[PDB]
Write a protein that binds this ligand. Structure first.
Ligand SMILES: Nc1ncnc2c1ncn2[C@@H]1O[C@H](COP(=O)(O)OP(=O)(O)O)[C@@H](O)[C@H]1O
Ligand SMILES: Nc1ncnc2c1ncn2[C@@H]1O[C@H](COP(=O)(O)OP(=O)(O)O)[C@@H](O)[C@H]1O
Ligand code: ALF
Ligand code: ALF
Ligand SMILES: [Mg+2]
Ligand SMILES: [Mg+2]
Ligand SMILES: [Zn+2]
Ligand SMILES: [Zn+2]
Lengths: 343, 365, 366, 321, 366
DNA sequence: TTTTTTCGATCGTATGTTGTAACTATCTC
DNA sequence: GAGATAGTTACAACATACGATCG
């Protein structure tokens, strides 16, 4: 199996085609761009007919198998596209894919698009069989650190002069949503044919459409960026995310920090990290968080979390978000007069 | 037979549209250069002009003279589109046609070539209400759009739409109109209507609009009705007082200033309106908590409190934190005691008086 | 506006024009039939924004000119409910329609006729006349091959072609192509158009086996058919229909003449024994012999051997049972002729007596 | 045989409406000038009379004498509207008509012209109970309705309506009626009905009404039933005014003066009288609260309890807060 | 315990018994059916704790007494799988039964028969036998008036009353009443019982064209009907029923006579524009005249006039057209007699030819 | 090199499958 | 030329999946 990235597909396609292609990832923009490039190359090579299906146990595989076995009246080199379910392949779906693999031939070109497969999902007889003659594309949304590089590359590709301040503004406003970034770049290019994208021009034609996850909120809390944490929490509230997931995500890290701080007085930090099986990249952030606050904090935080959970469940209240913001400020280096904690 | 200002006064050219400069400029440049995307999506708040801009774009695309950024407005096609009688203009109301069998009959008619116009425009409004299978059919159509067919989509909440439709469409987000723009538009409309007005009345109407020009026009109509053909400041003030709902913040301000008379007046006004007392206490507690958060960090407020952001920030700047904590504790105790009070209004009055004057004695160890 | 007619005369046109109309139309007015009295005639019009049906009835009673609209379902039910032999007198009063039948009275709401959509007038390009039987045969021969629902919309309809004195119908679905031809009898300019499935279905429904000639007019984008007192107007689907001539084999070297009934019954027996879905049927032809075997993975190979009039080189080919069964059923005769070039090549089937109807099918790849 | 007072005494003209002067003035000015909107929303508490005002507006629009702010009330259209038989007054029960199918049917049957009247008035009651799909379907129709179609909406909880629906309508919020207006209306109704009454009974009924006039009428019916055709102070006190007696004030004064024997004697007297204990505690708490309010603001005490005013003021001057 | 079974004989009884059985077992043994052998017959029984159905099949070959339980789904699948005309050999061998289909031996798990909730002893309080035609007529004429889902649980069934030599079926739902009486030729004690909807509908379903009489026996808590080779047992509501004769109007002053077909057609024609949700009509009855008026929420109106035999004072009455139409359809006669008293009183409907059955409809007050 | 959220009761919208009743067509009397 | 039996279409009832609000 040839592993590649969306930035390295044009050269491979120009060099030659392949029996099948697999597109796995999370970002819709890169996936659709790869799909479009592959389809354009196939059409240039004579693939005229294109058919699309969504993988689903409700959907019938008989039609797909008949299409694979059948031959068009006045066409050749058909293209078949399969959209995997968001949850992932099931045992029945795995068996159906294994059956389909045999039907594959030279003219038929299979393109699979779907979410990234887990370790168990990746382990499959059909996947292993096709690995010998398959090209896989890794499509992972770049992190905030990697985002400005991608934005600069996109601006250069479209022949746009983008300033550092404009790059930062675009990264902040449309973090985690590459499709919005691309559409904003297109709109800006249309607005000014000259292509001189100054900071005011971008500021006057940009809206807030960032997308975040609870893990990002917890990481921001650990870092201590109060503004970033508040922005992430506001975005999560706006998009309609249940606070239960946020609470459970924060609970694990809070308890881990409490335990480490309690045990840090007698054991080296590295030994504790090794015992608790923490990620290597997270060790620095964990150490910074531990050194940033003392046992006085991380104890009132537990009280806040318990009170918030009780209010959510027993009372079925609606002030959960205010308590979450207060806890976020408390985790950051803030006074937190402690009347709200109700100690 | 006077007509509603919102219905009577509608944009007819990109020049008439107030604000939304970026979207109009982008559309004009695209039309001039010939870059026409196969699907456009319009998003924004209420009364920002999504449907008006969509109709103007439809006029521009099918104008007899040519594909011009600014439609002439005099040719037969422009008039028919304005009247909603154009042969190739189809205005699908997804709200009342969420069924699959209703959308399929139109996606099938997409096949036929336009009778008169260059393009067979399909204007779908309130697209977010369509069903899942309808979304699938629309996705198929957008995947294979004939070169002579265009799609215009308007939705207040684009989040509901599947990501595939968003990817296969060019999005345009319309910003909420500023206070000055709404005031200027109201002044122009009233001047063209030969109706007397006062600057303070216009300012109050613009403030009450909250970024929706349609709300501004509705309030202007109400003021004209109340003022007997005149937009007088007295009538606008009376209307706003009758429909005012910021009584919680006013009560908080009065409590901070320690003015009993204003507190009593606000309580009487709330009693006349019938606002729930426990809800009022909860709102006051939330306001105090948010003011404390603002004092801790200015980034506490976002777009949710944009209506009353200035007052909240001023209170945060002025009030010392300790007074805010004391008021919060007093109101919390009052909320705890409210159920046992003989009357909820009586409990609220007692709590407010206690916060004003009676300082709780902090328990000793 | 008023008139007086009989239920017997008015029953048929109501059913004819109320057929396609139904469900919930996009515009309310589209759900109402347009009734117009003028020139001693009553015209009933029903439209669906893409097709129009008009019926005309002669009047032998005093009347007044006018036009109005009336809901189709309510009016049809009222007319059908009256006793047989009764006479219906209709009048327009204010913005309402009053219907009298003996001592029974009905009142209905109506809408202005001005707002009723009117199909833009167009000039016909090719106008001619055709007998009913020929068009019935063409439609029957070139109907089953159409694609009920396909991504390529232009394949949904069927191709009507005129050339000299020949009228040809072509249908396809991407796997099988059926072509039929008839002699028009009159010289006409060459021209090809595409008719959607709804249009051809309505045209077939309109014919009733009568001897009345059919007047067919074809314009730039619309097709009009006059049959007796009925006018049917339809729009033409825009597209580029694939060329049927290229698909046809240039010179099939191998030919096989067999009995239509024998092949049909053999295929039916195989299908009954092969009721399981998936896979196709493999037929091996040898000199004066044919062997048909189901291609099931594990099911018993209940192969059937039949005798045919063949003497060429033997070969094995796989086919889909449904396509061959449909071709055999559609071509109802006693003998058939099948021509082919090689294994990977489309096989053509026709009648040994006449070559008017041809069906070309791509073999299943294996 | 007698019909309920609430149904019988329904305002049939704008002159019979008690209070709500701002809304009535606005509607009268709109009708007189001719600036008639196609979407009116009425909000407020219960019993304020939103439905009555909607019916009056419907009468005003569809009157054979023309569009007038003062409907005649004698023409057949007015009579039919009053009797709930007019053909061009479509009343929708949104509480039962919640599913979007009914809304779709209504919007499909909205194009036809009215039978007799000059408008087809759709009065939807309890509109807040409609599902979101019904609101979305009604949006566009409210935006550009036919000229001969008017929409009237009424609800108690306008906070749960979609923001767009609120933007698409003219809002009128009715406020709760004060004590004096309720008392005057009750006095007028009783005078018309030829039933004896006493001023304190009317005062107690008005105080117990708490804004809602329908509550006042129901309590008046209860008082009439209890008093056997008369509205007496004792009859009203039996059911409602079991509280508000000088015993509570005497107990408060005794407690302030630390007179244990007097308090015990008052308790024994109340027990002999058969006084509810929770009501007694409620009255004592209320008296203490009103004394506190007097200490805060001298104008806290109104005429309602003027009989004891002086005494109350004394307790305000001596007792520290 | 050798049993020889023919697929032809076994097919229909198996489907009949499996009918009531549903997918949801609710109990380990409820899905299973009880198969027993007695003397020279085999009984297959199935129940869901509310209704029981048992079918008997004659046996000729020698056998010995026995009783067991077999799952319904597995037995049905086995019967379906075997080719038509096959002979099934069933034997008891330990805890698992043996099925010998040709050379195929199958072992089927068997649960003890002592745990099957089957009634052992039956006591009949009142038993009789009637032809299927009479019972079918009574059920057909009285079923449509039963309530479906009402708070008054005693109104959710049909009242069967035996009085002297008369059998009476009564159905009511709070708005309409249907009473039917028929002689039986046998003297029975005065006894009334209530049968729920499920029992009545199952009895009607199992009942077929009159071939043999059916015997019905009613005990303290249950009713058992044996017809042909099937026995169906159900339980009773036991909630007491209102007296029908009280509901019937007393001394109806106004009497009207009319033709069944004419009134049915008039009501059907008037219902076209009647309200869809309510279906309300107004009848103005005057001397030898009946005027039917229907109104619509869309302001549409329909009026019809009919000639009848009436001589009383003019009256106006509102009604639900659906109930009247149902009563007329069920009556299925030529002349219909309507008895009424005032405009706010229930109206009775009967046949002039005979008074075997009567109906009562309560008018709608506006 | 990877991490999955409270629960019970009630209301509303849209699609797919099965069974029964009503209406139509064909063959034999 | 008409009636009876068998087949096709339409309507009503039941089952499954997804989304939202308040306690
Ligand atoms: N940008 C704008 N400029 C001028 N008028 C506007 C604008 N946006 C909205 N309006 C006013 O609002 C009324 C209705 O707009 P509407 O179709 O509701 O827009 P949307 O679809 O964004 O809600 C119009 O009559 C128009 O006068
Ligand atoms: N402003 C008013 N003037 C006189 N009577 C009123 C008024 N408001 C309400 N009522 C009385 O209260 C009763 C109920 O009013 P209702 O129509 O239910 O108002 P709402 O719709 O606000 O509940 C009416 O029968 C009427 O007699
Ligand atoms: F017409 Al709108 F939001 F009110 F699009
Ligand atoms: F009828 Al209401 F509040 F309007 F009870
Ligand atoms: Mg709009
Ligand atoms: Mg009301
Ligand atoms: Zn123009
Ligand atoms: Zn009048």
């Amino acid at each position: 199996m040839i592993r590649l990235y969306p930035e390295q597909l044009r050269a491979q396609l120009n060099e030659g085609l392949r029996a099948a292609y697999l597109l796995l990832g999370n970002d819709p923009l890169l996936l659709q761009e790869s799909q479009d490039a592959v389809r354009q190359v196939a059409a240039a090579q004579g693939f005229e007919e294109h058919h699309t299906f969504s993988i689903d146990p409700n959907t019938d595989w008989n039609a797909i198998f008949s299409l694979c076995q059948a031959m068009s009246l006045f066409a050749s080199r058909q293209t078949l596209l399969l959209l995997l379910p968001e949850n992932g392949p099931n045992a029945a779906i795995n068996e159906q894919l294994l059956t389909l693999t045999g039907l594959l031939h030279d003219d038929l070109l299979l393109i699979v698009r779907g979410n990234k497969l887990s370790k168990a999902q990746e382990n499959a007889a059909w996947f292993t069989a096709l690995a010998n003659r398959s090209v896989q594309v890794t499509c992972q949304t770049p992190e905030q650190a990697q985002l400005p590089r991608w934005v600069a590359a996109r601006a250069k590709q479209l022949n746009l002069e983008l300033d550092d301040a404009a790059n930062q503004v675009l990264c902040y406003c449309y973090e985690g949503n590459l499709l919005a970034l691309a559409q904003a770049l297109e709109r800006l290019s249309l607005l000014w044919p000259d292509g001189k994208l100054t900071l005011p021009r971008v500021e006057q034609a940009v809206n807030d459409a960032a997308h975040f996850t609870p893990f990002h909120w917890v990481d921001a809390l650990l870092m201590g960026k109060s503004k970033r944490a508040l922005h992430i929490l506001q975005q999560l509230r706006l998009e309609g995310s249940e606070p239960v997931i946020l609470l459970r995500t924060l609970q694990r890290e809070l308890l881990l920090l409490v335990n480490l701080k309690r045990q840090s007085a007698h054991t080296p930090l590295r030994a504790l990290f090794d015992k608790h099986r923490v990620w290597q990249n997270r060790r620095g952030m964990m150490g910074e968080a531990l050194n940033r606050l003392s046992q006085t904090q991380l104890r009132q935080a537990v009280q806040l979390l318990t009170r918030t959970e009780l209010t959510l469940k027993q009372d079925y209240g609606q002030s959960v978000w205010a308590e979450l913001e207060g806890l976020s400020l408390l985790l950051c280096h803030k006074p937190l007069a402690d009347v709200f904690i109700d100690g | 037979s006077y007509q509603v200002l919102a219905r009577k006064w509608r944009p007819q050219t990109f020049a008439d549209v107030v604000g939304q400069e970026h979207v109009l400029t982008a559309l004009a440049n695209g039309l001039s250069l010939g870059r026409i995307h196969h699907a456009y999506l319009f998003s924004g708040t209420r009364g920002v002009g999504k449907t008006s801009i969509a109709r103007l774009l439809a006029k521009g695309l099918n104008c007899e003279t040519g594909i011009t950024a600014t439609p002439c407005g005099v040719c037969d096609n422009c008039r028919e589109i304005e009247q909603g009688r154009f042969v190739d203009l189809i205005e699908i109301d997804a709200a009342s046609r969420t069924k699959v069998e209703d959308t399929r009959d139109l996606l099938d008619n997409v096949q036929y070539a336009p009778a008169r116009g260059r393009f067979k425009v399909y204007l779908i409004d309130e697209v977010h209400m369509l069903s899942r299978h309808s979304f699938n059919a629309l996705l198929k159509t957008l995947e294979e759009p004939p070169e002579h067919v265009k799609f215009l989509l308007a939705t207040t909440d684009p989040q509901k739409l599947p990501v595939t439709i968003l990817s296969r469409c060019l999005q345009f987000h319309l910003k909420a109109l500023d206070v000055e723009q709404i005031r200027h538009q109201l002044e122009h409309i009233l001047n063209e209507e030969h109706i007397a007005h006062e600057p303070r009345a216009l300012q109050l109407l613009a403030r009450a609009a909250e970024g929706s020009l349609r709300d501004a026009l509705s309030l202007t109509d109400q003021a004209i009705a109340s003022g007997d053909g005149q937009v007088s400041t007295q009538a606008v003030s009376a209307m706003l007082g009758t429909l005012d709902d910021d009584q919680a913040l006013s009560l908080v301000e009065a409590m901070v200033e320690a003015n009993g008379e204003r507190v009593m007046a606000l309580i009487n006004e709330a009693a006349a309106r019938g606002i729930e007392w426990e809800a009022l206490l909860v709102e006051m507690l939330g306001l105090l908590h948010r003011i404390a958060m603002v004092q801790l960090s200015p980034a506490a407020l976002g777009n949710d409190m944009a209506a009353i952001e200035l007052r909240m920030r001023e209170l945060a700047r002025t009030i010392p934190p300790t007074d805010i904590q004391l008021y919060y504790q007093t109101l919390l105790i009052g909320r705890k005691e409210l159920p046992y009070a003989p009357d909820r209004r009586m409990g609220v009055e007692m709590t407010l008086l206690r916060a004003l004057a009676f300082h709780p004695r902090m328990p000793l160890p | 506006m008023k008139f007086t007619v009989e239920r017997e005369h008015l029953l048929k046109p109501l059913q004819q024009v109320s057929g396609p109309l139904g469900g919930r139309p996009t515009l309310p007015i589209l759900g109402n039939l347009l009734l117009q009295v003028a020139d001693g005639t009553l015209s009933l019009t029903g439209t669906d924004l893409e097709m129009e049906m008009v019926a005309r009835v002669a009047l032998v009673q005093p009347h007044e000119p006018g036009a109005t609209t009336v809901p189709a379902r309510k009016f049809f039910d009222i007319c059908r409910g009256l006793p047989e032999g009764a006479e219906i007198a209709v009048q327009l009063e204010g913005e309402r329609m009053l219907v009298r039948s003996g001592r029974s009275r009905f009142s209905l709401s109506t809408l202005p006729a001005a707002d009723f959509p009117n199909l833009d007038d167009w000039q016909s390009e090719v106008e001619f006349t055709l007998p009913q039987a020929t068009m019935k045969r063409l439609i029957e021969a070139t109907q089953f091959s159409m694609a009920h629902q396909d991504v390529r919309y232009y394949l949904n309809g069927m191709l009507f072609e005129t050339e000299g004195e020949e009228l040809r119908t072509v249908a396809t679905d991407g796997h099988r192509l059926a072509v039929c031809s008839m002699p028009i009898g009159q010289s006409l300019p060459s021209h090809s158009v595409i008719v959607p499935r709804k249009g051809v279905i309505e045209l077939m429904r309109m014919l009733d086996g009568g001897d009345n000639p059919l007047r067919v007019q074809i314009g730039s984008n619309n097709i009009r058919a006059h049959v007796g007192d009925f006018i049917f107007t339809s729009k033409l689907v825009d597209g580029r229909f694939p060329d049927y001539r290229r698909v046809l084999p240039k010179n099939p070297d191998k030919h096989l003449e067999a009995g239509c009934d024998l092949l049909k019954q053999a295929f039916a027996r195989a299908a009954i024994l092969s009721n399981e879905k998936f896979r196709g049927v493999r037929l091996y032809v040898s000199e004066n012999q044919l062997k048909i075997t189901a291609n099931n993975p594990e099911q018993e190979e209940a192969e059937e051997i039949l005798d045919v009039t063949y003497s060429g080189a033997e070969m094995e080919i796989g086919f889909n049972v449904s396509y061959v069964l449909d071709v055999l059923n559609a071509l109802k005769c006693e003998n058939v002729r099948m021509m082919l070039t090689d294994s990977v090549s489309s096989v053509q089937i026709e009648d040994a007596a006449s070559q008017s109807a041809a069906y070309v099918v791509m073999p299943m790849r294996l």
